[PDB]
Write a protein that binds this ligand. Structure first.
Ligand code: HDD
Ligand code: HDD
Ligand code: HDD
Ligand code: CA
Ligand code: CA
Ligand code: CA
Ligand code: CA
Ligand code: CA
Ligand code: CA
Ligand code: CA
Lengths: 672, 319, 673
């Protein structure tokens, strides 16, 4: 809305300077046709000054990311649990903007790095902007905000040579994890498939911290935010994610853009766990501790509303790069808790926007503006875009008739701190002993994964720790892993040629919890947007017919179909030269193309076959429609998620069940 | 000293760019003797770019002011009352820098405006820099920092026309004072001769707030800082201050500069009033309230050391 | 005019910048006597804003004030320029003007002796066009690369930052005496033009030669002169000094009040027009910004009317943030190879990066044009636009080739005058045509009246007597002596040095019209001039006399202040706050004669107001018939020019108003023999 008003149309008209004077911008002004450029060429300098100043500092973390606009719709009048206005009526709609991101990499790094992912949502409510600045993993690495630069310095590239980009696979990171055992829980999540989601639409969002819902009567309850994906949970496998980082660094932003454009905008149920203030310590851990989840067995989810993203931005820089989220953007009906991680975030996000924007008026950028009137005595500052008519901006005043009025619990629907909150005791720089169990919940998480999923997590640790040069850091890592699980420590140690320390059972247990497994979460609820590559040839008219008949059969079910051949032509979308298995969720070979799988200047040696073989190795549904092909590929016909049908319609019924299953995990070897 | 290492001498030598290339800077490079100036004139652009970027924002308050270097010398080993290293030995010397100022005027406004004055002192101690950012009046207008922009907007010029400069003599200021009665104590001080001191050397400095002195054993006492002028207290009269504002806007900064150059660097006894924690409310008011003084009859001054200013800066902008 | 960007706070509850209702009077604390909490976002957003309110002041002309208005063309000027704002009789264009001093910082006094800025933005229908001028038609230096030398020398000495807003110190006079180009502007600054009575009583000049360019490509050389319709008027130095203390805001207040009272100031926007062939025809080089074209060689042509009639709503957003540029040029105007102008073109685009903190400064409301913008400038800190065109490069096919190139032949593009050429070596050399630094300063001096010449001599005597270096004082005399031996002797006399022997190389007796203030005749209007009526509460008849006088004076548009010991109905100011610098004329009602000791004002205050007004040359008088007590106490002769005594209120006012138009009675100032 502030957005529509600031759109600039350049589909017609003559070029002008920024002050409306028509100009040109293709040739410099010179003293003679082979002469030096003149200082009086203001067309050249205004153009190049703007160019020279296009860049702004990247975000200090979550620098790599992508955003979209949408709507939130409330399912009910939630006045029974919160005063929040955006939650006060069945069907009440509030515009949103969401940015998704990795954490460690710089702004040009690959989407498919292994990382914690950001999921930040702004609700432009009729009582002010409210941001929930969350992640795809429900627990954080550290228990106090003051430690954030330590964590981030350790995971970001070593500062002498700035190596390695977007990766925890180096000595400093594992040194930190092994010395700061609070890290174990988020570390296990990041080493699971949660570190490499299939897309932003196939992950959940978590507020991480306990917050408060506050009623108009002043009573409060504790809450956790959980945004539950309506697309299902899905991951890449690590080898695939590595290839994708090189073949398509833009994979997740492309996926989101494309889903929105096709009318398949992603959806989440916005949910809370709600518990009483008296339950802060009732669950065997402290709700102020951001390294802990409340197991769903103890507190079920309440569905509050629907979040849908359905419109892409118009200008990436002005919208996505410039959006400036803050947990300090809070509204009446929500309040903070004394989580020491949340407490310090409140300071950082207001401060860091000065760095990014270069001045104090960052809330005036169209993407940051609210949708309601602003009334306050903030004035001046660089980049001031308002002309204030109140010439007495101080309180208390009579010269402006006492306006603006103070808003609070009683008057003007003011924000107010939950009035039940207290503090007592010494002023201390001490960690609560209630925070001290760093290992039971990582074990709970691990126990909750399926066997192949446990293997993938062990293998991610084997990969990264094998790259740590320091033998002392590797030993220290095994010491901590062993406190979570002796078996994990044993299996990781086997890959690095060290012995695992002896079992220490203090925190071992066999408890499980629901809703954290990706492999166990069942088939995808929808296959719309999933990508099918049909590997065809221009050498046989039969192959292109086969491909075309399959295309129309798959496309009607909302699948994105790419036909691949040696060269482009009508019906062929991509050449073998530019194609890769990371480009598809399923791969089908039309049997008329059999000969290509047995050299060409048009693509690299063995390319058609390697696409099929990669897709199979990575767990994807693979098929031949019409085998010589399965033999060349070493793919058994009876394998789950391997399809062989002469019939088109029987092939497509079977294949589409495979796309829903998504990964065929029997193709991955297990320890023992 | 970090300052000596950064001094740059230009009493000899040929002109250079900022990267050490000898150049000239008196005539632009032109296409012909009556021709247009060339873009390739890097000598011109480096010099003019610097000039174009010389200014930085003035301080949001106390923009008008002047500084000097000096020394603080402790009178005693004060370990019995504080762990502070700069106070831990008789005769212990610590370098200082002090800046004095008015409060409301912009950086080119007159020294002899009626106002509260700043007296900010940095002690470059051997256990880190310690600043006491004080004023010449021992009490402040407001009781909560969140009100500072209200106070300051009200005393600074009206924001439609930016009138009047460096003056509380307008409607908005008196509106604020009359609606916010905490202002009365400081208002009375500012309306006295303390609003128009004869010089920076003829005023005291106050920390205003109660602070704590903390011993190594962890015990604490409540303190107020009072820097007591060895030059005596003296004020202007208002009609004189008004004329002076016009005749010499630089009167206080000149007075300080000259006193230092002539070997008459100004001195203050750095003192504290020291009371027990149990006395926070014993004096008929709350020691957390920055609008209240402890009358000297209830708590005498202890002299901790001597502050002397005796060296002017080399570059006013840099220092 | 900028209505679209206004924010009203006359109603409503307090909100954050993101529209959440909040309070902002008490911090959040752990207990009623506890420490403040980091989670107090209300506190931190409000204080962070306050902490970041200030921006760097302008590198020069930091002290100034602005207003909105309108320019109206008097003709279709198509026959000399393609400029769209000048293309039809009565065509109107919105303007914004900022006036300023040059040397002082923010908060320094309006009434410092200085060169003054007069910067005008025309928001035209083919782009913003700025004329960034001064009240003096010549500049100190001949090459822009010297600007930091000039400005460092006149600004405060950089060890102690003394003195504020003044050329009265060694470094300034060292520079002037070593750089003789400075003589012409120096003589202007030392005249009454250095201390104008108001922004409304000074003229504006572009200083440089520019070009007017017709649509057929032909060009003429022009000088811009904005001629005041209020008349020219100055202060006297001794009055300027007191005013600097009594009212640092005097010029900005004068302008604000004139606009509020429906007396918005006016100027005729004029040019001198000459041919390209006349660049060296007048005995100097038109590329030299230290030279004027005497009006006897090229008369003024009136192009249109500039009137300022609306004050800003927010000074910071409008006046502080307005970012002028001589590179804001429009089709029909072009530059010349003046080496001072040439370098300015670079400076004003660069320096806004310092002020604004980022590259999108043309987006601030006050800087926006009033037409659409079509270009491929993108991103940058503080980007307010959301650009639709996702192919911002030329040449493109994916946006159908838009925006289109504009030039002489398509799209009304700006174009460089096509007859301009360059020839010769690439040189860092000064043209010998620039070498005569002294004949025009003498021309100026010759054109002032005798008392005006005395005032200029006295300004120099004042400033140079404050220069501590005896070598600098001698070098100063050397230069002044090349302009005029008599100036040098008279200045020397005050500093106890001897002037050097006459050097007649540049001496001459020529004069030129239009540069003298004293010689410019009575003011054409007295509306807005200030009359202080000194009265008393002791006598109800003195108040009656003051009331009668008020009615008669206000009817003619004068601003009347009745002064008494204390405020009451009919009395505007007390004696304690009154000063002669507050008035253009002073009247005592004869019922108040006794006042001429109290706890209510300083000793001698009523008399001092009258004596000051007399000694500074203002019309003064006593109304009622009994005048000798007051005039004798003040040592003012009853028969003096500009001294009035009448019983009749009507007759008193008639005579007094003739005196307000004369403005200054110069016969009260002593002359060197
Ligand atoms: C005290 C420092 C600090 C701590 C403890 C955290 N963060 Fe943070 N975060 C920042 C300091 C910060 C920041 C430096 O202020 C950033 C950089 C860019 C910005 O606007 O804020 C930021 C960016 C940022 C973004 C990107 C927002 C966007 O897309 O523009 C997300 C999603 C998060 N953070 C999420 C979290 C979560 C879920 C945390 C733990 C519960 C967390 N941060 C702890
Ligand atoms: C919450 C805001 C706030 C409040 C309540 C105060 N000030 Fe302050 N003060 C500032 C915010 C500030 C500031 C905006 O942060 C300044 C501007 C320049 C700087 O370094 O800090 C400052 C500058 C400043 C200076 C100038 C230091 C220098 O010479 O560079 C002095 C002397 C004071 N202050 C003294 C005080 C005293 C004695 C206070 C009450 C006891 C006080 N201030 C309350
Ligand atoms: C090469 C450097 C340079 C030179 C030779 C000049 N100036 Fe300039 N001028 C600047 C560099 C500059 C600047 C640093 O770029 C300023 C400071 C703030 C701004 O916007 O531009 C400026 C400000 C400025 C202002 C204030 C505009 C406002 O009110 O915001 C005026 C009126 C002038 N100048 C006028 C002149 C005239 C009449 C000159 C000689 C003909 C002149 N300047 C030469
Ligand atoms: Ca490392
Ligand atoms: Ca997985
Ligand atoms: Ca006011
Ligand atoms: Ca006194
Ligand atoms: Ca000097
Ligand atoms: Ca004069
Ligand atoms: Ca051209």
């Amino acid at each position: 809305s502030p957005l529509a008003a600031y759109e600039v149309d350049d589909s017609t008209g003559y070029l002008t300077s920024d002050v409306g004077g028509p100009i040109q911008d293709q040739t410099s002004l010179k003293a003679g046709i082979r002469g030096p450029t003149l200082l009086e060429d203001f067309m050249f300098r205004q153009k190049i000054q703007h160019f020279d100043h296009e860049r702004v500092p990247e975000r200090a973390v979550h620098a790599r990311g992508a955003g979209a606009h949408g709507t939130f719709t409330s399912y009910a009048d939630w006045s029974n649990i919160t005063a929040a206005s955006f939650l006060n009526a069945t069907g009440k709609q509030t515009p949103v903007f969401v940015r998704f991101s990795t954490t460690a990499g710089s702004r040009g790094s690959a989407d498919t790095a292994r990382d914690v992912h950001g999921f930040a949502t702004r609700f432009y409510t009729d009582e002010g902007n409210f941001d929930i600045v969350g992640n795809n993993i429900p627990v954080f690495f550290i228990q106090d905000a003051i430690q954030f630069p330590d964590l981030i310095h350790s995971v970001k590239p070593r500062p002498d040579n700035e190596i390695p980009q977007a990766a925890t696979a180096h000595d400093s990171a594992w040194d930190f994890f092994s010395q700061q055992p609070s890290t174990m829980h988020t570390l296990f999540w990041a080493m699971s498939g949660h570190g490499i989601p299939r897309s932003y639409r196939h992950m959940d969002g978590f507020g991480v911290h306990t917050f408060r819902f506050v009623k108009d009567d002043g009573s409060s309850k504790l809450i956790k935010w959980h945004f539950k994906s309506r697309q299902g949970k899905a991951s890449l496998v690590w080898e695939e994610a590595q290839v994708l980082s090189g073949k398509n660094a833009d994979f997740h932003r492309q996926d989101l853009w494309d889903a929105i454009e096709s009318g398949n905008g992603p959806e989440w149920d916005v949910c809370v766990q709600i518990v009483d203030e008296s339950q802060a310590q009732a669950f065997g851990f402290d709700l102020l501790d951001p390294t802990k989840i409340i197991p769903e067995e103890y507190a079920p989810l309440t569905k509050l509303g629907l979040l849908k993203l359905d419109r892409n931005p118009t200008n990436y820089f002005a919208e996505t790069e410039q959006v400036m989220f803050q947990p300090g953007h809070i509204v009446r009906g929500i309040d903070f808790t004394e989580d020491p991680l949340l407490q310090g975030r409140l300071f950082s996000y207001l401060d860091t926007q000065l760095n990014r924007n270069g001045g104090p008026n960052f809330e005036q950028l169209p993407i940051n503006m609210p949708r309601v009137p602003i009334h306050n005595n903030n004035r001046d500052g660089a980049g001031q875009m308002f002309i204030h008519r109140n010439k007495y901006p101080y309180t208390p005043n009579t010269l402006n008739s006492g306006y603006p009025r103070q808003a609070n619990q009683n008057a003007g629907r003011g924000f107010f701190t939950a009035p039940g909150r207290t503090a007592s005791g010494a002023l201390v720089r001490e960690v609560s002993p209630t925070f001290n169990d760093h290992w039971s919940q990582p074990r709970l998480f691990f126990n909750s994964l399926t066997p192949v999923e446990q293997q993938f997590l062990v293998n991610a640790m084997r990969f990264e720790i094998s790259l740590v040069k320091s033998e002392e850091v590797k030993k220290n890592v095994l010491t901590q892993l062993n406190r979570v699980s002796h078996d994990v420590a044993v299996r990781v140690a086997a890959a690095i040629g060290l012995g695992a320390p002896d079992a220490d059972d203090t925190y071992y247990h066999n408890n499980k919890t629901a809703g954290v497994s990706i492999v166990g979460s069942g088939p995808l609820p929808t296959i719309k947007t999933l990508r099918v590559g049909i590997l065809a040839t221009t050498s046989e008219s039969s192959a292109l017919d086969q491909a075309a008949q399959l295309r129309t059969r798959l496309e009607k079910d909302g699948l994105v179909v790419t036909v691949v051949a040696e060269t482009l032509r009508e019906g062929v979308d991509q050449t073998y030269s530019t194609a890769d298995a990371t480009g598809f969720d399923g791969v089908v070979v039309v049997d008329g193309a059999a000969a290509l799988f047995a050299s060409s200047p048009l693509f690299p040696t063995g390319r058609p076959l390697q696409i099929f073989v990669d897709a199979y190795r990575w767990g994807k549904p693979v098929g031949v429609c019409g085998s010589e092909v399965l033999d060349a590929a070493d793919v058994p016909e009876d394998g789950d998620g391997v399809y062989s049908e002469e019939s088109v319609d029987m092939f497509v019924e079977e294949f589409e069940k495979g796309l829903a299953t998504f990964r065929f995990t029997d193709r991955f070897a297990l320890d023992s | 000293s970090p300052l000596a290492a950064y001094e740059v001498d230009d009493s000899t030598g040929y002109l250079t760019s900022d990267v050490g290339g000898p150049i000239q800077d008196q005539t632009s490079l032109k296409a012909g003797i009556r021709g247009p100036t060339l873009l390739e004139d890097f000598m011109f652009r480096q010099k003019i770019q610097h000039f174009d970027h010389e200014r930085v924002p003035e301080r949001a308050v106390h923009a008008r002011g002047a500084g000097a270097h000096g020394t603080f010398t402790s009178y005693a080993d004060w370990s019995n009352i504080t762990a502070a290293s700069f106070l831990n030995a008789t005769g212990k010397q610590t370098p200082v820098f002090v800046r004095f100022s008015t409060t409301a005027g912009s950086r080119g406004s007159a020294d002899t405006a009626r106002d509260v004055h700043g007296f900010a002192t940095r002690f470059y101690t051997d256990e880190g820099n310690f600043d006491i950012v004080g004023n010449n009046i021992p009490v402040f207008f407001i009781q909560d920092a969140i009100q500072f922009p209200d106070l300051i907007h009200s005393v600074k010029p009206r924001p439609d026309n930016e009138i009047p400069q460096a003056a509380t003599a307008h409607d908005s200021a008196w509106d604020f004072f009359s609606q916010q009665p905490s202002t009365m104590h400081t208002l009375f001080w500012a309306m006295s001769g303390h609003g128009i001191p004869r010089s920076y050397r003829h005023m005291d400095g106050f920390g205003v707030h109660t602070f704590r002195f903390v011993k190594d054993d962890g015990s604490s006492k409540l303190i107020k800082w009072h820097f007591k002028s060895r030059q005596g207290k003296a004020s202007l009269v208002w009609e004189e201050a008004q004329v002076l504002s016009g005749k010499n806007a630089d009167f206080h900064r000149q007075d300080l500069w000259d006193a230092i150059e002539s070997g008459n660097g100004p001195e203050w006894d750095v003192c504290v009033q020291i009371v027990d924690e149990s006395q926070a409310q014993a004096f008929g008011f709350d020691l957390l309230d920055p609008t209240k003084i402890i009358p000297e009859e209830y708590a005498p001054l202890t002299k901790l050391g001597l502050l002397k200013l005796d060296r002017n800066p080399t570059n006013y902008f840099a220092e």
